[PDB]
Design a protein around this ligand. Structure first.
Ligand SMILES: *[C@@H]1O[C@H](CO)[C@@H](O[C@@H]2O[C@H](CO)[C@@H](O)[C@H](O)[C@H]2NC(C)=O)[C@H](O)[C@H]1NC(C)=O
Ligand SMILES: *[C@@H]1O[C@H](CO)[C@@H](O[C@@H]2O[C@H](CO)[C@@H](O)[C@H](O)[C@H]2NC(C)=O)[C@H](O)[C@H]1NC(C)=O
Ligand SMILES: *[C@@H]1O[C@H](CO)[C@@H](O[C@@H]2O[C@H](CO)[C@@H](O)[C@H](O)[C@H]2NC(C)=O)[C@H](O)[C@H]1NC(C)=O
Ligand SMILES: *[C@@H]1O[C@H](CO)[C@@H](O[C@@H]2O[C@H](CO)[C@@H](O)[C@H](O)[C@H]2NC(C)=O)[C@H](O)[C@H]1NC(C)=O
Ligand SMILES: *[C@@H]1O[C@H](CO)[C@@H](O[C@@H]2O[C@H](CO)[C@@H](O)[C@H](O)[C@H]2NC(C)=O)[C@H](O)[C@H]1NC(C)=O
Ligand SMILES: *[C@@H]1O[C@H](CO)[C@@H](O)[C@H](O)[C@H]1NC(C)=O
Ligand SMILES: *[C@@H]1O[C@H](CO)[C@@H](O)[C@H](O)[C@H]1NC(C)=O
Ligand SMILES: *[C@@H]1O[C@H](CO)[C@@H](O)[C@H](O)[C@H]1NC(C)=O
Ligand SMILES: *[C@@H]1O[C@H](CO)[C@@H](O)[C@H](O)[C@H]1NC(C)=O
Ligand SMILES: *[C@@H]1O[C@H](CO)[C@@H](O)[C@H](O)[C@H]1NC(C)=O
Ligand SMILES: *[C@@H]1O[C@H](CO)[C@@H](O)[C@H](O)[C@H]1NC(C)=O
Ligand SMILES: *[C@@H]1O[C@H](CO)[C@@H](O)[C@H](O)[C@H]1NC(C)=O
Ligand SMILES: *[C@@H]1O[C@H](CO)[C@@H](O)[C@H](O)[C@H]1NC(C)=O
Ligand SMILES: *[C@@H]1O[C@H](CO)[C@@H](O)[C@H](O)[C@H]1NC(C)=O
Ligand SMILES: *[C@@H]1O[C@H](CO)[C@@H](O)[C@H](O)[C@H]1NC(C)=O
Lengths: 99, 425, 166, 198
């Protein structure tokens, strides 16, 4: 009360100082149980790539995507994520990924 | 259509004609006044930055834009409580009517508290409370509703004390200590207060009591039938609700950010851009909160004007007899009775209204012996042959004597003077 | 999708293509558990303001705490419509309101400790009404009271250019 | 504390000003609350955005202060109108409005200046010592009903007098205290007595 009124002496009354809120007791993390790794290798290490005018699209689904292997590698000269942060990619689930 | 201003009616004015009432009616009209708003309270941090340390740290960069909103809302709440205390708590003691209702024929059973009722509220109070009427969302985004200091039963007790004081002591309980007086005598004083001699009440006591009872019954039926009568109070409530509802829907706006959900931003982006997006959200939500608080301030100023008016009315209408025209119902004011209502008060204004009138031939003065005689209190009238002196607001003709009239001057100065006989007792 | 709150069994009927619900405030209201096909309703866990009823440091340093609009089971304890009061004793006696808590409950400092009571509107006084009895004063008093009214503020003026861009 | 109201006003205004001043210490999302540091540290293209942030924040603070001042000044103007009405009807005259000029029947008022306010000394009349008397709405003398011109009939047990309502001063009932009307078959509660004729 003293620090919310900014006075070493506070006269009688009822003063609102702060807000009481319960704190979480346990941390719950939920995800679907899928084991197979996403076949990123067949995309980045593909022997042949399609011409830009006919850019290839691959559907990535029903797999675990360890994006760290991608953004911790030194093999890429440009890595730019728009609307997402690459570090956060390990804590997100996507609808249906396309490469 | 071009709206009409009212029924056309000329007045048959002429320099020697007066229209005097020959009958009256006791009318109980109703006047509703809001007294207090809903004691809202907003959690600035939880509304803007619900359960997020990073958003709270970004928010505290804006300084005292949160504490002063809470200060304003607490001021509003204290103002509402003061409003209620001003309007209702104007009686030092808590009076009670006697077990026997020997009020000269007047029947207050429909406005006096019901002993068996669950809240000591009268029938009409129950009707009022039953004619005035999503909360989880509000109470999850930091918004909450504080309870008024005076519970509704306490307001009912206050109104019952005021009503009992008025009934059993007239206006005396407002000035000093309550001084009992038979109700008929009180009404005689009120009639004298409106320029009607007190014999009129005693000669029509049964009729006047019946008229008052019928008016109270009509008030009961009107309240039980038409809810919109209490619109004002309802309107107040509705306004507040809308405010809060809006204040919640503004949590769904992006305000330019990538998403209106804080958790999505905090999960998808790192601080260098997350804090930009959260700055956008904080600016938008803080602007919304400031707008809400300004609206609350304006509406509380309005409600404070209304509460001051209601307190003035309770002082000069219930606790006394007001001579101010149309301040206590159309017609001449006899008395008033308070009634509690959700966030407001309802006055029953008992007023005296002339009903049946007759044209008489009048005269400013009568010339008897060269001297001019004027009426001490009243007016000279003639039914065609004889000249009487009556009171202005009720045709009660009386022989003209030196006790009804006073002499001043002579007959050569007054314009319109007539000749007649002034009887000497 | 991260957040904080209480998860409870729901009665919502999610469609097969819907993951999570939403509230009117565009905040998530319910979710589908990724491993068990069950709908969990999310309700934010209890919160509310905290007020410090104090008699004033001039007379004492003892204070009571009011948790607003919460249940005492969730936080010498007293439950009232205003909330949960801690550090104040509940007294059946009634006095004039000194520090208003709410819902007809006021707190004071009396012999010492802080007490919470249901405020008294006034002294009970029945009027001896009768159809043939009047009460007439035989003496009077000339009372001088004081009424204070504000009439003006301080004529403040702000140099906006110097305030914003000094 | 008697003059609390006036003091309160002052306090409120002060707080506003204080708040306003403290708003100068807020970054409002900029990199520093100090304008000169922003100017000296960043390049003009981005220092311009930072100073725009600061300008928006400080302008919003000023707007909030001005709006609050407008509302408080409306409050103070309502109060000043009430005080002017009280001075007109209370000091310059004698009001019959109940509780408008102090509890009790109003006699007069005296103004007194005060810092940003006025203080009315309301001199009023308050009945103190009250007695129970039997009463009647009229008295029946010769078949006619007599009502008091200005007052009420009272009885100390044996005799009937007519007294003014607000001060017990019994006087013998005479044709100069009372006026005649109707007959004794109408008034509910009429009593028998003698109307003395001077
Ligand atoms: C004054 O008006 C009242 C109506 O308010 C009259 O009372 C009515 O009188 C008629 C008979 O003429 C009865 O049938 C009604 O039942 C009465 N109504 C009520 C409410 O009592 C009264 O007679 C009128 N008096 C004069 C002298 O005109
Ligand atoms: C005052 O009016 C009430 C009605 O508002 C009267 O109560 C009625 O009394 C009769 C019996 O006399 C019952 O048959 C009714 O059912 C009652 N009505 C209600 C609504 O309860 C009351 O009697 C009147 N007072 C006097 C002294 O007659
Ligand atoms: C009222 O009476 C007076 C006197 O009794 C009348 O005055 C007379 O008027 C006539 C006509 O002008 C004169 O011839 C008389 O000399 C007047 N008498 C006196 C004593 O001055 C007056 O006209 C009467 N008015 C009415 C309306 O009847
Ligand atoms: C009316 O009340 C006043 C006081 O309010 C009475 O005056 C007192 O009279 C006694 C003796 O007569 C003195 O001892 C007191 O000092 C007086 N008080 C004041 C304030 O002057 C007065 O006597 C009362 N009159 C009646 C008729 O009861
Ligand atoms: C009621 O008042 C009347 C007059 O004020 C009293 O009558 C007088 O009483 C005194 C005694 O104090 C006698 O000396 C007079 O002779 C009485 N006057 C007459 C005309 O008889 C009367 O006694 C009072 N009664 C009571 C019960 O107090
Ligand atoms: C692609 O090849 C590199 C080196 O041969 C290997 O480190 C990587 O794991 C492979 N798969 C990818 C990049 O998905
Ligand atoms: C009084 O006279 C006017 C003259 O036009 C008439 O209209 C009116 O009805 C009269 N009043 C009564 C009560 O008859
Ligand atoms: C007028 O009243 C008097 C007395 O009341 C009566 O003698 C006379 O006949 C009345 N005249 C008319 C026209 O009513
Ligand atoms: C009223 O006016 C008429 C003229 O219209 C006049 O003849 C008459 O004397 C006047 N009467 C009075 C009492 O003024
Ligand atoms: C995934 O979880 C569900 C329910 O929790 C279970 O029925 C299923 O067998 C699990 N799948 C695997 C591969 O463990
Ligand atoms: C508070 O708790 C009491 C008993 O613990 C219970 O009866 C009451 O319903 C609760 N109120 C709320 C709003 O949860
Ligand atoms: C107060 O009253 C309640 C019932 O009204 C009773 O249960 C309680 O024991 C009382 N407490 C004291 C201290 O008298
Ligand atoms: C009047 O009488 C009632 C009951 O008879 C009593 O309670 C009251 O105190 C009396 N008033 C005075 C002023 O003596
Ligand atoms: C007062 O009531 C009693 C009984 O109820 C009755 O005898 C008496 O005549 C009444 N007096 C008046 C003035 O009404
Ligand atoms: C009053 O006197 C009349 C006669 O003048 C008589 O008829 C009546 O009964 C008396 N009433 C009382 C209450 O004495």
């Amino acid at each position: 009360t003293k620090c919310t009124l900014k006075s070493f002496t506070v006269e009688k009354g009822i003063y609102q100082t702060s807000n009481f809120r319960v704190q979480p007791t346990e941390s719950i993390v939920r995800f679907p149980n899928i084991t197979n790794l996403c076949p990123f290798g067949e995309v980045f290490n593909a022997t042949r790539f399609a011409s830009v005018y006919a850019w290839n699209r691959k559907r990535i689904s029903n797999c675990v995507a360890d994006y760290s292997v991608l953004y911790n590698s030194a093999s890429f000269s440009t890595f730019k994520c728009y609307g997402v942060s690459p570090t956060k990619l390990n804590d997100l689930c996507f609808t249906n990924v396309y490469a | 259509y071009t709206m009409s201003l009212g029924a056309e009616n000329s007045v048959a004015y002429s320099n020697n004609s007066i229209a005097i009432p020959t009958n009256f009616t006791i009318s109980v009209t109703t006047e509703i006044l809001p007294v207090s708003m809903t004691k809202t309270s907003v959690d600035c941090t939880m509304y803007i930055c619900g359960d997020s340390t990073e958003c709270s740290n970004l928010l505290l960069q804006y300084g005292s834009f949160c504490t002063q909103l809470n200060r304003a809302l607490t001021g509003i709440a204290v103002e509402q409580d003061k409003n209620t205390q001003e309007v209702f708590a104007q009686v030092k003691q808590i009076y009670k009517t006697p077990p026997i209702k020997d009020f000269g024929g007047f029947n207050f059973s429909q406005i006096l508290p019901d002993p068996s009722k669950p809240s000591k509220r009268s029938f009409i109070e129950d009707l009022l409370f039953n004619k005035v009427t999503l909360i989880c969302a509000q109470k999850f985004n930091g918004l909450t509703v504080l309870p008024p200091l005076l519970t509704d039963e306490m307001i009912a007790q206050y109104t019952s004390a005021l009503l009992a004081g008025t009934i059993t002591s007239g206006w005396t309980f407002g000035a000093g200590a309550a001084l009992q007086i038979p109700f008929a005598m009180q009404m005689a004083y009120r009639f004298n207060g409106i320029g009607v001699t007190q014999n009129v009440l005693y000669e029509n006591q049964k009729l006047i009591a019946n008229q008052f009872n019928s008016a109270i019954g009509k008030i009961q039926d009107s309240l039980s039938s038409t809810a919109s009568a209490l619109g004002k109070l309802q309107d107040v409530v509705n306004q507040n609700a809308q405010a809060l509802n809006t204040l919640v829907k503004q949590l769904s706006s992006n305000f330019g950010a990538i998403s209106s959900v804080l958790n999505d931003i905090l999960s998808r982006l790192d601080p260098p851009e997350a804090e930009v997006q959260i700055d956008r959200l904080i600016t938008g939500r803080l602007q919304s909160l400031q707008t809400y608080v300004t609206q609350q301030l304006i509406r509380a100023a309005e409600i404070r004007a209304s509460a001051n008016l209601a307190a003035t009315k309770m002082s000069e209408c219930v606790l006394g007899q007001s001579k101010r025209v149309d301040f206590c119902g159309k017609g001449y004011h006899l008395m008033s009775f308070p009634q509690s209502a959700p966030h407001g008060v309802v006055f029953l204004h008992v007023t005296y209204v002339p009903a049946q009138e007759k044209n008489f031939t009048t005269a400013p003065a009568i010339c008897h012996d060269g001297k001019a005689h004027f009426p001490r209190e009243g007016v000279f009238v003639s039914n065609g042959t004889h000249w009487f002196v009556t009171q202005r607001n009720f045709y009660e003709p009386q022989i003209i004597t030196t006790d009804n009239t006073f002499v001043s001057g002579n007959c050569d100065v007054v314009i319109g003077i007539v000749n007649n006989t002034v009887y000497d007792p | 999708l991260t957040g904080t709150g209480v998860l409870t069994e729901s009665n919502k009927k999610f469609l097969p293509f819907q993951q999570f619900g939403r509230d009117i405030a565009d905040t998530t209201d319910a979710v589908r558990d990724p491993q068990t096909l069950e709908i969990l309703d999310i309700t934010p866990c209890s919160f509310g303001g905290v007020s410090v009823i104090t008699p004033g440091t001039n007379t004492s340093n003892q204070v009571a705490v009011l948790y607003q609009d919460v249940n005492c089971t969730e936080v010498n304890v007293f439950q009232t419509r205003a909330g949960c009061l801690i550090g104040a004793e509940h007294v059946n006696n009634s006095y004039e309101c000194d520090i208003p808590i709410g819902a007809g409950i006021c707190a004071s400092y009396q012999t010492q400790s802080i007490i919470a009571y249901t405020m008294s509107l006034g002294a009970e006084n029945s009027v001896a009404y009768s159809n043939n009895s009047i009460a007439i004063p035989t003496n009077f008093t000339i009372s001088v009271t004081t009424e204070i009214l504000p009439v003006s503020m301080t004529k403040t003026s702000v140099d906006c250019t110097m305030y914003i861009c000094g």
